[PDB]
Amino acid sequence: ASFNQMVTALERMMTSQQRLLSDISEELRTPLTRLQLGTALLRRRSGESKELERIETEAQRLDSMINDLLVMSRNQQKNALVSETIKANQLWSEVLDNAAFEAEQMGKSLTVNFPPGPWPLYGNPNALESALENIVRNALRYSHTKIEVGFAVDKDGITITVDDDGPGVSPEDREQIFRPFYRTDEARDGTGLGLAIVETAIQQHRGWVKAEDSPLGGLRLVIWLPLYK
Amino acid sequence: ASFNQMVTALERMMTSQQRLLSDISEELRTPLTRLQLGTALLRRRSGESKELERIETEAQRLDSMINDLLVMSRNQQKNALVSETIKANQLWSEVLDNAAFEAEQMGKSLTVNFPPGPWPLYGNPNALESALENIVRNALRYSHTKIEVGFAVDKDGITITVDDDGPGVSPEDREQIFRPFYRTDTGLGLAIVETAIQQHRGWVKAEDSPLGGLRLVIWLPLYKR
Ligand SMILES: Nc1ncnc2c1ncn2[C@@H]1O[C@H](COP(=O)(O)OP(=O)(O)O)[C@@H](O)[C@H]1O
Ligand SMILES: Nc1ncnc2c1ncn2[C@@H]1O[C@H](COP(=O)(O)OP(=O)(O)O)[C@@H](O)[C@H]1O
């Protein structure tokens, strides 16, 4: 099919686009360190300016973001594999088992409302496995007492819903939650790349992600992935 | 299965990393622009400042590098969309003719051991044209006296071998030579080459050359109708 040709062409482009991101992340360190040596010079080779202090906090922010990018890009290349057929139960049963154990260790509870069936998917098993893993990790951290995971299926695809009873996220901030480096003031008191990685991985797999208010009181994350024909 | 479903699936695939790169860029550019505006205020207050000068050029370099990744990302999108059938001779004959002239101007020599024939390829002609152009310009710069270009074909694909009598690259550095902005002593040439060749379902290798310098081997599959 023409569609199969287009998917393969775009899959190849996604590889070259990941190679690009990781490589320039390593490259950004070189002018950043040279910039910081300039701000380190003027710090005692001239007065302790409030102006120079303001340039150093901007350089600090840049450094912080570049370091987070290196941590991110390391995995988005190492863990990047060829696209294969995988069943939803095979793919996510281990993630859900480890998450239930981690919850139990925190005195919290993880309930799987409806389990993943043998529903066929197509893509990178590690990327899809980590996409659910990052959502559930956030739920484990921010929930007060409980986490809920629910699977749904139909002719078109699989819907995964992760709920928690913690504080949620305001409707304004739920808009920017998937943005790279975005962190709510509650969390600021973590890189902010987690949900950015999740959104990209799921969009690369021809699906979508949503952040909503949870019936449990906290945050609800909804992943949709297409069924493999 | 519907046409709208197929367009949405491809739209998600096409724009996924573009948007991540774009959003990361905006996020990096918030403290970077503030830094650049801050240093411009202090440079106007005191012009004679070699330290502020250095901070300004490093910030400029950061901005320029972030811009290069966005431009390259956009070019990778063009490569996936724009694809036509092209013959190896039509595609690379001009590159080899201009390179031979440039070599002659430097007192150097460019020898085409075996020329490209009317061998069919499929993809982005500009991406594949620039892939050879970047390899040959590198050979023209780093060679001492000679450059050699050799084409090979079979039922599966075309092998292009570019040799030079220059210094070469150490086996350790030949591993990191295809990374963007990379140097030894823009640095985007071999980066443009590797991503474009891999997007075209081919491969690139850096090896020691029998001429003494660097050997670059490109392999591209043949177009089978
Ligand atoms: N389940 C949740 N409950 C409350 N806030 C959350 C939850 N998940 C994510 N967030 C908020 O969204 C922000 C962005 O999430 P994320 O990208 O995963 O960041 P990080 O990688 O630092 O953990 C977090 O810093 C936090 O403020
Ligand atoms: N023929 C060669 N001989 C020696 N070194 C080379 C050769 N070709 C490339 N290099 C080295 O590999 C690096 C990466 O190449 P490239 O991306 O094309 O950079 P540039 O933008 O300077 O052409 C160059 O900066 C150079 O140090």
From Swiss-Prot, chain B:
Quaternary organization: The isolated cytoplasmic domain (residues 188-457) crystallizes as a homodimer, and forms dimers of dimers in solution which may be catalytically important. Interacts with periplasmic accessory protein CpxP; interaction with CpxP is not seen in vivo when cells are grown in 0.3 M NaCl, or if the misfolded P pili protein PapE is overexpressed. Interacts with cognate response regulator CpxR.
Effect of residue 30 to P: In cpxA101; a cpxA gain of function mutant, decreased autophosphorylation, decreased phosphotransfer to CpxR, loss of phosphatase activity, responds to periplasmic protein overproduction
Domain note: The periplasmic segment (residues 30-163) defines the sensory domain. Conformational changes in the cytoplasmic HAMP domain modulate the mobility of the central alpha-helices (which bend at Ser-16 and Pro-31) that allows formation of 1 kinase-active state.
Active-site residues, record numbering mapped to chain: 26 (nucleophile)
PTM entry text: Autophosphorylated. Maximal phosphorylation of the dimeric isolated cytoplasmic domain (residues 188-457) is about 70%, suggesting the protein may be hemiphosphorylated in vivo; probably occurs via a trans-autophosphorylation mechanism, i.e. one subunit phosphorylates the other.
Binding site for ATP: 26-29, 137-142, 164, 183-184, 186-190
Positions in the Cytoplasmic compartment: 1-225
Portion held of the full protein: 223 to 456 of 457
Domain of life: Bacteria
Effect of residue 6 to V: No response to excess periplasmic protein, decreased autophosphorylation, no phosphotransfer to CpxR, no tetramer formation of the C-terminal domain in solution
Name of the protein in its database record: Sensor histidine kinase CpxA
Domain Histidine kinase: 23-224
Compartment(s): Cell inner membrane
Coiled coil: none
Function: Histidine kinase member of the two-component regulatory system CpxA/CpxR which responds to envelope stress response by activating expression of downstream genes including cpxP, degP, dsbA and ppiA. Activates CpxR by phosphorylation; has autokinase, phosphotransferase and (in the presence of Mg(2+) and/or ATP or ADP) phosphatase activity. The kinase activity is inhibited by periplasmic accessory protein CpxP; proteolysis of CpxP relieves inhibition.
